[PDB]
RNA sequence: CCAUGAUAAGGAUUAUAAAUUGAAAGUGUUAAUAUCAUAAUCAAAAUUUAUUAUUUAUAUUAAAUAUGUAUGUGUAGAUAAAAUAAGA
């Protein structure tokens, strides 16, 4: 059938206000850093549709700031 | 009867209203448009003759 | 015929189908009506060839033909009723009730956005958005930029 | 509820007030008096009888001279323009109803 | 420094800079990055910016390989031509076509000079091909700059995305207008574009095909459009568009009115008669003088005819300055002293056209052709149809 | 030929063309910032 | 959900679901489909050919000298796709 | 005027208060809606989407 | 009312499907196709200061 | 030349509106007054659409 | 007979000049409807450069 | 598929070049003209035919021709993918389960099992029929091969 | 084709192989007039007055319809009668019978 | 029984139905019994068609053609003013059916249309068809519409017709009109013997022989039928003196590949 | 100086023929003295859908709409390219001819480039011939000086 | 006549000091309403029908028909809103 495509099942992971993890969220700001994502160049992020976060067009595989500027660049300027 | 006419449509039921399953598959972007550029098996005989 | 077999949950959805006919008839009869109106209303001489009583008689004959055109679509577009094609909800163009690009009512657009049926990018509800034309003048400025792109860039030989 | 300027969804909400003497021509009528009368004043094809003339038709001398009955649609079922006069010439029917 | 200017100059400069954007000549003879024969602009459109960026990179590398191949084969051909060649007789005739050269007379161009000009053109083409190949061989994986015209060929340039905000109410409840306005959300439709520029020094049909066929293997949910800017040759002859004096009575503003373009203006070029009927008494030189052309040009136009009879249909030279114009302004008048059929036969026109052109004759004439002949006295002269009018050598010029 | 020979002919091999992994490994590498005893 | 089925072409949910291709991927071509070259089909138009002769051909291959000789008589006889009105008895 | 935010380098207005679609000048210099967004909408905004591509009976 | 999703991994596999799954995917095929606690906790915590990670509680 | 070569003659448009000429000659329409008697008396009421 | 643009504010103010009392109409912006109803048949870039 | 068939797509280009140069198209051999006609039929179309090609009726007529000739494998509207492919568990870090993120219809030979890990001459030695089970299956595998 | 980890191990190529390029190019035909070639020139007195089915139909503005305006004028002149067209009245002609026609 | 229509008639011929009844017919599984618009009687079809165009056509009572002498509204019946009384103060400007139809050359400017009717008259025999194939006659264009060739969205089977009309290719109307009007004769002769265009052909021949190639082309622009080979012969002959090779090739091609290879002479 | 001019200057017909020989520049070439070959370039847009407006019924009218939208053809011609000797032996456009041409084309000329954008007809094949005809008219009127 | 979803109302608290120009808007529920998946006799063209955030004193109707009635010393009771590029 056409619907036979939409039948693959995903297995549950194997273990050993709302939406927020208290342990990570309650960590002190001055230590955790006022950041919600890795500090890589913003060209790697795309505003996710239907989700209130920003994901990367490359799955993981973060590139540092020095991967975009010429070698030994000042302030990562071209 | 040939064994390639598979029933793509599922059995009618309340699923087609209750769920968000599509009633057709999406168009294939990288599939060429079908056009007729063949020989009727008789034009070849005509040209050979 | 009358709610025996309709195959649809909303019977008003046929109004969109019949309004497409109105648009098709407008496309058919726009040129003729415009030419007739221009010729009838023009008072200065048409050309060096035709002047005076010939022009007056031609104007009256043209307006007589235009009046005899039965079924010619001569209707302002804002008078056309706007209803979304999916839920038969009526919306007024120029207000938040209607979405111009999707051509659906506010209710239908909100439903399709809350569901996964339209690809839109959420921005701040009380801003101007990403577009620089919107941020640098607003709706009128983007309107003028669209006009400039469409027309006011060609040489028009 | 607010709607775009001069694009009110209501079409008959326009209340034609008492005619103003100073203009009396540049109000509820054609912007120019050298324009032809609208189509409602004429007969397009062979009809079987008009139920009632629309309110957009302008008033002419022939309305009072011919004597034929004329009527329009208003809040009641119908309104006939009984006792024809000559004071209302060059005006549309909508200006003589007071809905 | 510091910069101080005047308001009028500033306004004029700003307006001129805004206006003069599409007035750029892409295909020039300059060497370097600019200067080529054909320019292709491929605009790639996608729902997402990274999608269109990656598509641009893929298409740029593919076109880099294809253009390197095509320019390499063209360079091989150019080198083989430069090694040795034969001057084309058609090319030599084309060079020897100016009646007066840049030295007041005939241009005696020989094969040596034509070959020298061809060699100069081939050297320029070889230099351009080498520049293209060298700029294409640069972007290795270690260091690739696809947006730089010098670094990569073909290079890619950015373009502003199309963002259209939709603003609509989100409260399904039909509450008051204030509540509806408070429940307002903004969403937007985005479309991202990338422009790829290929400046080739020659017209390549194979390259055009290979770049047209990229729409079959474009990325997912990505479209493309093609812009072509190629040099073309346009012939402007002084026969269908001649240069002459303005008319004795100039046209006034009344000829330029609303709907006048369809009433008192023909579509250029105007029909100028190339055929001619030789008149009685006109000699070989007299006909040339009457037509404002040389005797040599006239005899070249009509060399099959050794002599011109009293009445013969000859062909005027194409470059004659006294060529008449069809449908001469002077009306044609027929005097009958007789019926409509006879008039149509003698005018070589259809009876319906004759009736509609006469107009008043139709009104005067009754059912019978005898009555038409009787009213012919009152109608007097009949105007011939416009298709039957003939021009004259003195009814057209002042 | 619809396939340029500069993609399969070893006579037209590009010496300067690196592999598909070295550049990604290198530009992924983030060297330690403690090059000097201060700062 | 609903009597109106969802459109699988423009719906972001079905487009980016687990069973389709997400937008955070290389977006390359899924498969190089080739149908017409693997098995082509002949051209069969439901409408008849508009340029056919619509008749019977006779292959009038007369010698040129005799054609010139009998041309005044041959004008009455039919030519290629032309049927004169000359009566048969004549 | 470059001194204004909405500068575009082209006159976007006719600067005539008494300007409307009725007058023959507007009629002559206006643009017909043929092959416009109106024509696109008149064929794309079908209440049933799977009817502009193919007929339902033929597809079934 | 509520469709059966069967999130259990033991309720969605049957021998008939496993027979065909095993031939294509097995241990040999997978092998062929694939290639101080205090100090360890401290280094794990401080590695979150990398350019691609965040400090986590 | 006398006049512009690419200029439509009068007969070309006379053929376009021939029946109007015949009808006007039959009905003897000497003139059609488009403005009333004292039109210029009131300089603001009688405005043409091209005014 | 024609008059050059006036130089004094009194002439502009006291001369018979009307005001905009109805909707603004543009020959090329008859399409796209009004602002906030802007219509685009094709989602091309706004600063699109024609060949 | 065979990739050299694309070399006939440049035949119209060289024919246009022949017309530009003055080389007659009818001054070719008959067999070469037959091959040229085949190439033009394969890779030649006009704007008039492009404005109406690929209509729904034409595509469905092509589908009907394919059904009559028994070749429905490559048709998008007719192809059905009953078999799916699971992941491969790695011996390193085996405590983590994986899940699908995207699904593609890729041909079988990409993940075809090794020849030695497969019954020899399976096509002739065995007959395999893929059919759907009539009874309800909670686990899955709607279409199984016997 | 040799690769066996195409999507099992997530080996998604960012460049489309030449084999797929050739397949996709050979799948679809070529527009014959897509190639530009001309040596005779431009038809100054033709190429616009062609047959009605394949005519050079104008687009956009009324000013480009000089032939259509002429045909429409000729047709309306032919069809409508003046004895009927003379019944159209102007506003001032109607108002001339008013007690106070002008002020 | 709550039947919408009391009566119905078949459409198949009595000679073929009585023999075809022996062959079972595959009906639609979810609706075997089909009662389409053709099966309606003449009076029922007329009433339904009149009611269909209630918005713009004569469906509205006051619009016209209502054939009803009194109208009951607001619990107060009102009589109808006849046309004879109406025309006393409404000057009649009726032209007749000749006004609704525009010339053939205006089809491109009217987006593939000739008739200026309330309903869109398709040129294909599948949208406005009612049993018989749809044929649009421009000499009988009337509001009553004895042939239901128009397109309205209020009949019994209007939805499919509207879908087909909106799902039409480019040049659909022009192509259908040209193909149905002009075709090769069964005798194999060219369709170049029509009388309504023969004077135009003679006029073009005279202009070409006089040398007025521009006038000949301008007249050729307005032709509707296939011109004879003499027209092409004269046009090429008159282009010969001017060396207008481009014009000669264009006029040759306009009749070679487009009009039944008439110029192949 | 005369030798240098002889060795450097190329006639219009010679240059156009050389261009069409080596650089494959399409276009008719006139060898008559009254004919002058005008170097020019043409610009247009060609677009074919591949996402959802192919292989179905609506594809045809969508493609027709795209072609009608992109019917514009832009013809560019340089005044420096026009300033060459013609077949008769005189300069095709002089200073006065150029000034008259610039006056005739108020905004159609710019940055020394004469640009004519023709949207007259629904197809580029007719837009190009309309643009060439109008350019020929403009040149004929401008040469009057 | 589909009863089910959204919305309205609407809150939370860590950033020592130096440096930096920086490192900074978040929602349950109770409510009302409604056009969606769920229970057959009837609202969208003929509109009067009363539906919160309006132009107050030098100049006031020209282009789709576009408002003749409330001047009264700006004088009640209740109601809503904000610490946001402003200056409690």
Can you give the three-state secondary structure of chain E, one letter per residue? CCCCCCHHHHHHHHHHHHHCCCCCCCCCCCCCCCCCCEEEEEEEEECCHHHHHHHHHHHHHHHHHHHHHHHHHHHHHHHHHHHCCCCCHHHHHHHCCCCCCCCCCCCCCCHHHHHHHHHHHHHHHHHHHHHHHHHHCCCCCCCCCCCCCCCCCCEEEECCCEEEEEEEECCCCCCCHHHHHHCEEEEEEEEEEEEEEEEECCCCHHHHHHHHHHHHCCCCCEEEEEEEEEEEEEEEECCCCCCCCCCCCCCCHHHCCCCCCCCCCCCCCCCECCEEECCCCCCHHHHHHHHCCCHHHHHHHCCCCCCCCCCCEEECCCCCCCCCECCCCCCCEECCCCCHHHHHHHHCCCHHHHHHHHCHHHHHCCCCHHHHHHHHHHHCCEECCHHHCCCCCCCCCC
Q: Any chain N CB within 8 A of the CB of L51?
A: yes
Q: In this structure, what token pair is assigned to residue O84? A: 């060459």
Locate the DSSP E strands across chain L. 44-45, 130-132, 143-145
Which of N243, J49, L116 is CA-nearest to residue C37?
J49
Distance from CA of L30 to the nearest CA of E (A): 26
How far is E266 from M28, CA to CA, in rounded Å?
45
Asked whether residue D29's C-beta has any atom of DNA/RNA strand P within 7 A, the reply is yes
Distance from CA of L118 to the nearest CA of M (A): 17
Q: Any chain L CB within 8 A of the CB of A4?
A: yes
How far is K43 from K38, CA to CA, in rounded Å?
12
Nearest nucleotide (C1') to alpha carbon of D29: P65
How far is L3 from L9, CA to CA, in rounded Å?
12
Query: Is residue J23 within 8 Å of E270, Cβ to Cβ?
Result: no
Which of G32, H59, B10, G34 is CA-nearest to residue L80?
B10
Residue whose token pair is 């494959």: O24
Query: Is residue J5 within 8 Å of E397, Cβ to Cβ?
Result: no
Residue of I nearest to L139 (CA): I12
How far is L77 from O56, CA to CA, in rounded Å?
13
Q: In this structure, what token pair is assigned to residue O31? A: 């060898």
How far is E124 from E118, CA to CA, in rounded Å?
10
Q: Any chain B CB within 8 A of the CB of O54?
A: yes
Nearest nucleotide (C1') to alpha carbon of C106: P35
Give the strand pairing for O73-78 and O35-47.
antiparallel
Residues from chain C that touch E163, judged by Cβ atoms under 8 A, are 129-131, 134
Residue whose token pair is 């990409």: L110
User: Which C residues 44-73 have CB within 7 Å of strand P?
Assistant: none
- Rounded to an integer, what is the distance from CA N189 to the centroid of its chain? 26
How far is A2 from E183, CA to CA, in rounded Å?
40
Beta bridge partners of F18: none
Does the beta-carbon distance from E184 to C96 stay under 8 Å? yes
User: Which A residues 32-71 have CB within 7 Å of strand P?
Assistant: 34
How far is E160 from C142, CA to CA, in rounded Å?
14
HSE (side-chain half, CA atoms, 13 Å) at I27: 3
How far is N123 from N113, CA to CA, in rounded Å?
9
Which of G41, O60, N176 is CA-nearest to residue L55?
O60
Query: What is the dihedral sign for C-alpha H42, H43, H44, H48?
Result: positive
Backbone angles phi, psi at M26, to 5 degrees: -80, -15
Nearest nucleotide (C1') to alpha carbon of J51: P62
User: What SS3 class is residue N81?
Assistant: strand
Estimate in Å the CA C15 to C1' P53 gap, whole number: 36
CA distances from C141 to E12, E136, H12, K46 (A): 22, 42, 10, 12
State the DSSP code for C115: T
Residues from chain O that touch H40, judged by Cβ atoms under 8 A, are 65
Residue whose token pair is 């040149």: O139
Return the residue in C68, C71, C83 with the most chain N beta carbons within 10 A, the one to mutate for interface testing. C71
Query: Is residue O79 within 8 Å of O94, Cβ to Cβ?
Result: no
Which of D71, D60, D12, D62 is CA-nearest to residue D37?
D60
Nearest nucleotide (C1') to alpha carbon of C114: P6
**E153 contacts: CB under 8 Å, gap ≥ 6:** E64, E67, E132, E135, E136, E138, E198
Residue of G nearest to B25 (CA): G8
Does the beta-carbon distance from D36 to C93 stay under 8 Å? no
Nearest nucleotide (C1') to alpha carbon of A28: P14
How far is H5 from C141, CA to CA, in rounded Å?
9
**M59 contacts: CB under 8 Å, gap ≥ 6:** H34, H35, O68, O71, O119, O120, O121, O122
**O19 contacts: CB under 8 Å, gap ≥ 6:** E121, E231, E233, O25, O39
- State the virtual CA torsion across O72, O78, O84, O87 in degrees, nearest 10: 0
How far is A28 from A20, CA to CA, in rounded Å?
15
Give the strand pairing for M30-31 and L44-45.
parallel
User: What SS3 class is residue O42?
Assistant: strand
- For residue G89, count CB atoms less than 10 angstroms from its CB and return exposed for 0-12, middle for 13-18, buried for 19 or more: exposed
Does the beta-carbon distance from E69 to F20 stay under 8 Å? no
- For residue A21, count CB atoms less than 10 angstroms from its CB and return exposed for 0-12, middle for 13-18, buried for 19 or more: exposed
Length of chain L, in residues: 146
How far is L103 from A7, CA to CA, in rounded Å?
12
Q: Which chains touch N (3 or more CB pairs under 8 A)?
A: C, D, E, G, H, L, M, O
Do chain A and chain O touch with ≥3 beta carbon pairs under 8 Å?
A: no
Give the burial string for K23-43 (b: 16+ CB within 10 Å, else e).
eebbbbbebbbbbbbbbbbbe
Asked whether residue D78's C-beta has any atom of DNA/RNA strand P within 7 A, the reply is no
CA distances from C99 to C106, C107, C109, G8, O110 (A): 6, 10, 7, 22, 41
How far is O102 from H16, CA to CA, in rounded Å?
30
Nearest nucleotide (C1') to alpha carbon of D5: P66
Query: Is residue E233 within 8 Å of E205, Cβ to Cβ?
Result: no
Query: Preceding residues of all breaks in chain B (C to N beyond 2.5 angstroms)?
Result: none
Locate the DSSP E strands across N2-144. 70-73, 76-79
Q: Any chain C CB within 8 A of the CB of A53?
A: no
Which of N139, N103, N136 is CA-nearest to residue N119?
N136
- For residue E254, count CB atoms less than 10 angstroms from its CB and return exposed for 0-12, middle for 13-18, buried for 19 or more: middle
Query: Is residue L132 within 8 Å of L142, Cβ to Cβ?
Result: yes
Residue of O nearest to M46 (CA): O129
User: What SS3 class is residue D16?
Assistant: coil
Do chain D and chain L touch with ≥3 beta carbon pairs under 8 Å?
A: no
Q: Which residues 52-91 on chain M approach chain D with CB closer than 8 angstroms?
A: 87-91
- State the virtual CA torsion across E319, E322, E327, E332 in degrees, nearest 10: -150
How far is C93 from E185, CA to CA, in rounded Å?
17
How far is L72 from N111, CA to CA, in rounded Å?
40
Query: Is residue J14 within 8 Å of E357, Cβ to Cβ?
Result: yes
Does the beta-carbon distance from O108 to C155 stay under 8 Å? yes
Give the burial string for D38-61 (b: 16+ CB within 10 Å, else e).
ebbbbbbbebebbbbbebebbbbb
The shortest CB-CB distance from H41 to any of C103, C140, C152 is to C103
Alpha helices in chain H (DSSP H): 24-29, 37-44, 56-59
Query: Is residue C28 within 8 Å of N120, Cβ to Cβ?
Result: yes
How far is N96 from C69, CA to CA, in rounded Å?
10
How far is L40 from O39, CA to CA, in rounded Å?
34
Q: Any chain N CB within 8 A of the CB of D63?
A: yes
Query: Is residue J13 within 8 Å of E264, Cβ to Cβ?
Result: yes
Give the burial string for O123-141 (b: 16+ CB within 10 Å, else e).
bbebbbbbbbbbbbbbbbb
Asked whether residue D20's C-beta has any atom of DNA/RNA strand P within 7 A, the reply is yes
Distance from CA of H56 to the nearest CA of C (A): 13
- For residue E358, count CB atoms less than 10 angstroms from its CB and return exposed for 0-12, middle for 13-18, buried for 19 or more: buried
**O51 contacts: CB under 8 Å, gap ≥ 6:** B29, E221, E222, E223
Query: Is residue O44 within 8 Å of O74, Cβ to Cβ?
Result: yes
Q: Any chain M CB within 8 A of the CB of H27?
A: yes
Method: cryo-EM
Beta bridge partners of O45: E227
How far is C84 from C90, CA to CA, in rounded Å?
7
Query: Is residue O125 within 8 Å of O46, Cβ to Cβ?
Result: no
How many beta-carbon pairs under 8 angstroms link A with C? 4
User: Which E residues 167-196 have CB within 7 Å of strand P?
Assistant: 170-177, 179, 182-183
Backbone angles phi, psi at E352, to 5 degrees: -65, -45
Query: What is the dihedral sign for C-alpha I29, I33, I35, I37?
Result: negative
Residues from chain J that touch M92, judged by Cβ atoms under 8 A, are 35-36, 46
Q: Any chain J CB within 8 A of the CB of M50?
A: no
How far is C102 from H45, CA to CA, in rounded Å?
9
Query: Is residue O36 within 8 Å of E240, Cβ to Cβ?
Result: no
Query: Is residue L78 within 8 Å of B4, Cβ to Cβ?
Result: yes
How far is O122 from O119, CA to CA, in rounded Å?
7
How far is H32 from H39, CA to CA, in rounded Å?
11
How far is O144 from C112, CA to CA, in rounded Å?
65
Query: Is residue C21 within 8 Å of H10, Cβ to Cβ?
Result: no
How far is M38 from I30, CA to CA, in rounded Å?
63
Q: Which chains touch J (3 or more CB pairs under 8 A)?
A: C, D, E, H, M
Backbone angles phi, psi at D96, to 5 degrees: -130, 40
User: Which H residues 1-60 have CB within 7 Å of strand P?
Assistant: 17-23
Does the beta-carbon distance from B27 to O50 stay under 8 Å? no
**Category of E347 on φ-ψ map: left (φ > 0), alpha (ψ -120 to 50) or beta:** alpha
Q: Any chain M CB within 8 A of the CB of L52?
A: no
User: What SS3 class is residue L13?
Assistant: helix
Locate the DSSP E strands across L9-133. 44-45, 130-132
Give the burial string for E156-179 (b: 16+ CB within 10 Å, else e).
beebebbbbbbbbbbbeeeeeeee
Which of E264, E271, M43, E233 is CA-nearest to residue O133?
M43
Query: Is residue M67 within 8 Å of N236, Cβ to Cβ?
Result: no
**L136 contacts: CB under 8 Å, gap ≥ 6:** none
Beta bridge partners of E41: E197, E227
User: What SS3 class is residue I32?
Assistant: helix
Helix axes C14-41, H37-44, angle to 10 degrees: 150
Asked whether residue J49's C-beta has any atom of DNA/RNA strand P within 7 A, the reply is yes
Q: Considering only CA atoms, which residue is closest to the C1' of nucleotide P41?
A: C3
Q: Any chain N CB within 8 A of the CB of O28?
A: yes
Residues from chain E that touch J9, judged by Cβ atoms under 8 A, are 327, 329, 386
Do chain L and chain M touch with ≥3 beta carbon pairs under 8 Å?
A: yes
Q: Any chain H CB within 8 A of the CB of L104?
A: no
Which of A57, K44, L77 is CA-nearest to residue E195?
K44
State the DSSP code for A12: P
């Amino acid at each position: 059938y056409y619907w036979s495509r939409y039948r693959m099942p995903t297995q549950m992971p194997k273990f050993d206000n709302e939406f927020i993890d208290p342990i990570d969220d309650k960590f002190p700001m001055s230590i955790r850093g006022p950041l919600v994502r890795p500090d890589v160049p913003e060209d790697q992020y795309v505003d996710s549709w239907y989700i209130c976060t920003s994901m990367t067009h490359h799955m993981g595989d973060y590139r540092p700031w020095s991967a975009s500027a010429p070698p030994n660049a000042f302030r990562f300027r071209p | 009867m040939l064994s390639q006419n598979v029933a793509k449509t599922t059995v009618p039921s309340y699923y087609m209203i209750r769920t968000n399953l599509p009633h057709r598959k999406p168009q294939n972007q990288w599939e060429g448009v079908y056009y007729y550029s063949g020989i009727t098996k008789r034009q070849r005989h005509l040209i050979l003759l | 015929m009358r709610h025996i077999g309709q195959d649809v949950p909303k019977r008003h959805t046929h109004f969109v189908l019949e309004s497409r006919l109105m648009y098709e008839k407008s496309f058919r009869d726009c040129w003729l009506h415009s030419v007739c109106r221009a010729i009838s209303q023009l008072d200065e001489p048409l050309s060096k060839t035709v002047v005076g009583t010939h022009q007056k008689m031609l104007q009256r004959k043209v307006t007589c033909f235009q009046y005899n055109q039965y079924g010619l679509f001569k209707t302002p577009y804002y008078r056309l009723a706007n209803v979304d094609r999916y839920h038969a909800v009526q919306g007024v163009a120029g207000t938040r009730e209607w979405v111009p690009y999707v051509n659906v009512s506010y209710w239908t657009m909100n439903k399709m956005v809350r569901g996964g049926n339209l690809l839109v990018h959420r921005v701040h509800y009380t801003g101007w958005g990403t577009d620089s034309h919107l941020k640098k003048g607003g709706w009128e400025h983007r309107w003028n930029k669209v006009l400039q792109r469409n027309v006011l860039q060609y040489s028009r030989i | 509820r607010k709607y775009p300027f001069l694009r009110r969804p209501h079409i008959k909400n326009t209340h034609s007030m008492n005619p103003s003497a100073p203009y009396f021509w540049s109000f509820m009528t054609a912007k120019s008096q050298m324009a032809f009368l609208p189509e409602e004043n004429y007969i397009t094809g062979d009809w079987t009888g008009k139920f009632f003339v629309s309110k957009r038709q302008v008033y002419t001398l022939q309305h009072a001279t011919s004597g034929a009955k004329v009527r329009v649609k208003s809040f009641p079922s119908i309104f006939e323009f009984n006792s024809p006069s000559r004071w209302n010439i060059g005006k549309e029917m909508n200006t003589l109803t007071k809905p | 420094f510091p910069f101080q200017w005047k308001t009028e100059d500033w306004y004029e400069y700003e307006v001129a800079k805004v206006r003069n954007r599409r007035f750029v000549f892409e295909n020039t003879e300059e060497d370097g990055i600019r200067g080529s024969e054909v320019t292709y602009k491929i605009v790639l459109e996608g729902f997402w910016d990274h999608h269109v960026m990656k598509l641009a990179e893929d298409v740029c590398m593919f076109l880099k390989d294809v253009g390197r191949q095509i320019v390499e084969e063209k360079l091989v051909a150019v080198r083989r031509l430069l090694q040795g060649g034969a001057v084309d007789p058609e090319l030599l005739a084309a060079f020897n076509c100016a009646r007066a050269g840049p030295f007041g007379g005939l241009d005696e161009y020989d094969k040596e000079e034509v070959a020298n000009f061809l060699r100069s053109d081939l050297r320029r083409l070889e230099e351009q091909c080498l520049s293209v190949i060298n700029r294409c061989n640069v972007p290795v994986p270690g260091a690739t700059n696809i947006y730089d015209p010098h670094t990569s060929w073909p290079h890619v340039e950015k373009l502003e995305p199309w963002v259209r905000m939709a603003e609509f109410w989100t409260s399904s409840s039909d509450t008051s207008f204030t509540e509806l306005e408070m429940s307002t959300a903004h969403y937007e439709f985005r479309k991202f574009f990338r422009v790829i520029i290929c400046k080739l020094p020659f017209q390549s049909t194979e390259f055009e095909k290979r770049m047209y066929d990229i729409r079959h293997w474009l990325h997912r949910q990505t479209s493309c459009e093609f812009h072509t800017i190629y040099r073309r040759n346009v012939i402007h002859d002084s026969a269908v568009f001649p240069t002459e004096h303005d008319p004795a009575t100039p046209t006034t503003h009344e000829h330029h009115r609303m709907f006048s373009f369809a009433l008192d203006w023909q579509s250029a070029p105007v029909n100028r008669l190339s055929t001619d009927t030789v008149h009685e008494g006109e000699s070989w030189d007299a006909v040339a003088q009457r037509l404002g052309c040389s005797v040599g040009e006239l005899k070249d136009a009509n060399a099959e005819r050794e002599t011109i009879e009293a009445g013969v249909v000859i062909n005027v030279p194409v470059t004659a300055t006294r060529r008449l114009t069809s449908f001469g302004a002077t009306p044609l008048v027929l005097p009958l002293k007789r019926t409509w059929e006879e008039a149509a036969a003698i005018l070589d026109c259809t009876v319906e056209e004759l009736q509609q052109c006469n107009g008043h004759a139709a009104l005067t004439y009754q059912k019978k052709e005898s009555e038409a002949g009787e009213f012919d006295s009152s109608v007097t002269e009949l105007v011939a149809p416009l298709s039957c009018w003939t021009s004259t050598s003195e009814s057209e010029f002042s | 030929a619809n396939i340029p020979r500069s993609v399969w002919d070893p006579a037209q091999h590009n010496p300067n063309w690196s592999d598909s992994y070295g550049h990604d490994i290198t530009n992924r590498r983030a060297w330690p910032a403690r090059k000097w005893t201060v700062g | 959900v609903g009597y109106t089925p969802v459109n699988p072409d423009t719906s972001p949910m079905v487009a980016y679901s687990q069973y389709h291709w997400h937008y955070n991927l290389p977006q390359g071509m899924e498969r190089p489909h080739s149908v017409n070259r693997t098995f082509a089909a002949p051209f069969q138009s439901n409408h008849s050919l508009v340029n056919k002769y619509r008749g019977v051909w006779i292959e009038f291959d007369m010698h040129p000298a005799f054609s010139v000789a009998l041309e005044p008589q041959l004008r009455k006889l039919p030519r290629g796709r032309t049927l004169p009105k000359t009566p048969a008895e004549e | 005027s470059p001194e204004f935010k909405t500068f575009t380098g082209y006159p976007m207005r006719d600067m005539r208060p008494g300007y409307g679609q009725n007058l023959p000048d507007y009629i002559m210099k206006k643009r017909l809606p043929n092959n416009t967004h109106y024509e696109l909408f008149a064929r794309r905004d079908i209440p049933n989407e799977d009817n502009a591509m193919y007929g339902k009976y033929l597809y079934d | 009312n509520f469709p059966a999703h069967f999130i259990k991994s033991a309720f969605t596999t049957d021998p008939l499907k496993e027979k065909q799954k095993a031939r294509f995917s097995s241990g040999g095929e997978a092998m062929r196709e694939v290639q101080d606690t205090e100090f360890q906790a401290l280094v794990e915590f401080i590695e979150g200061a990398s350019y691609d990670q965040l400090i986590s509680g | 030349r006398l006049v512009e070569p690419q200029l439509r003659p009068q007969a070309a448009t006379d053929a376009l509106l021939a029946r109007t000429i015949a009808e006007e000659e039959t009905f003897k329409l000497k003139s059609i007054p488009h403005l009333p008697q004292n039109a210029e008396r009131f300089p603001h009421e009688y405005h043409t659409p091209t005014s | 007979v024609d008059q050059t643009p006036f130089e004094e504010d009194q002439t502009w103010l006291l001369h018979s000049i009307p005001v905009q009392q109805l909707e603004m109409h543009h020959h090329e912006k008859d399409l796209q409807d009004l602002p906030f109803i802007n219509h685009e048949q094709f989602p091309r870039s706004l600063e699109w450069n024609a060949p | 598929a065979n990739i050299n068939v694309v070399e006939k797509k440049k035949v119209p280009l060289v024919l246009a070049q022949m017309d530009e140069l003055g080389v007659p198209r009818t001054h070719l051999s008959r067999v070469l003209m037959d091959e040229v006609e085949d190439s033009l039929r394969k890779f030649q179309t006009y704007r008039s035919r492009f404005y109406e090609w690929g209509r729904a009726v034409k595509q469905f007529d092509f589908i009907e021709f394919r059904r009559r000739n028994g070749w429905l494998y490559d048709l998008h509207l007719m192809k059905c993918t009953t078999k799916q492919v699971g992941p491969l568990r790695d011996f390193n870090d085996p405590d983590a389960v994986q899940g699908a993120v995207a699904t593609a219809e890729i041909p079988a030979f990409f993940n075809e099992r090794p020849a030695w890990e497969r019954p020899p001459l399976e096509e002739t030695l065995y007959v395999t029929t893929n059919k759907e089970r009539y009874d309800d299956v909670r686990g899955g595998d709607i279409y199984y091969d016997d | 084709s040799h690769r066996r980890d195409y999507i099992r191990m997530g080996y998604i190529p960012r460049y489309t192989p030449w084999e797929w390029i050739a397949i996709q190019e050979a799948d679809q035909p070529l527009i014959a007039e897509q190639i530009r070639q001309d040596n005779i020139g431009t038809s100054y007195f033709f190429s616009l007055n062609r047959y009605w089915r394949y005519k050079a139909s104008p687009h956009g503005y009324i000013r480009h319809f000089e032939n259509e305006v002429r045909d429409l004028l000729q047709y309306v002149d032919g069809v409508t009668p003046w004895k009927q067209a003379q019944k159209i009245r102007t506003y001032w002609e109607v108002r001339s019978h008013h007690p106070m026609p002008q002020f | 029984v709550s039947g919408v229509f009391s009566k119905g008639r078949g459409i198949g011929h009595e000679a073929t139905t009585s023999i075809l009844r022996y062959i079972p017919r595959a009906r639609v599984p979810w609706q075997p019994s089909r009662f389409g618009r053709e099966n309606l009687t003449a009076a029922d079809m007329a009433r339904l068609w009149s009611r269909g165009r209630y918005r713009d056509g004569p469906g509205n009572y006051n619009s016209g053609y209502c054939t009803e002498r009194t109208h009951v509204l607001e619990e107060n019946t009102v009589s109808i003013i006849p046309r004879r009384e109406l025309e006393k103060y409404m000057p009649d400007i009726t032209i007749g059916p000749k006004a609704l139809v525009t010339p053939v050359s205006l089809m491109n400017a009217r987006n593939g249309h000739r008739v200026t009717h309330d309903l869109l008259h398709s040129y294909d025999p599948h949208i406005g068809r009612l049993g018989k194939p749809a044929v649009v006659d421009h000499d009988n264009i009337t509001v009553e519409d004895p042939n239901r060739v128009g397109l309205n969205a209020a009949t019994l089977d209007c939805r499919g017709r509207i879908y087909r009309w909106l799902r039409r290719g480019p040049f659909f109307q022009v192509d259908n009109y040209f193909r149905r009007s002009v075709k090769l004769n069964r005798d194999g002769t060219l369709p170049t013997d029509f009388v309504h265009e023969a004077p135009l052909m003679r006029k073009i021949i005279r202009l070409a022989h006089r040398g007025h190639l521009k006038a000949a082309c301008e007249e050729y622009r307005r032709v509707t039928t296939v011109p004879p080979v003499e027209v092409y012969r004269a046009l090429t002959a008159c282009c010969v003196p001017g060396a207008k090779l481009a014009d000669a090739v264009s006029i040759f091609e306009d009749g070679d590949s487009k009009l039944f290879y008439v110029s192949r002479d | 100086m005369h030798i240098f001019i002889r060795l450097s200057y190329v006639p219009h017909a010679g240059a156009a023929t050389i261009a069409r020989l080596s650089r494959r520049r399409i276009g008719p070439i006139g060898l008559e003295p009254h004919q002058f070959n005008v170097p020019a370039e043409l610009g247009f847009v060609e677009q074919y859908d591949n996402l959802q407006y192919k292989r179905y019924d609506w594809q045809g009218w969508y493609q027709r709409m795209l072609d009608v939208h992109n019917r514009n053809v832009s013809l560019r011609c340089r005044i420096c390219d026009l300033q060459r000797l013609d077949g008769n032996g005189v300069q095709f456009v002089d200073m006065q001819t150029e000034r008259r041409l610039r006056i005739l084309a108020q905004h159609r000329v710019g940055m020394g480039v004469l640009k004519l954008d023709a949207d007259k007809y629904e197809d580029q094949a007719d837009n190009v011939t309309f643009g060439t005809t109008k350019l020929s008219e403009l040149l004929a009127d401008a040469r009057k000086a």
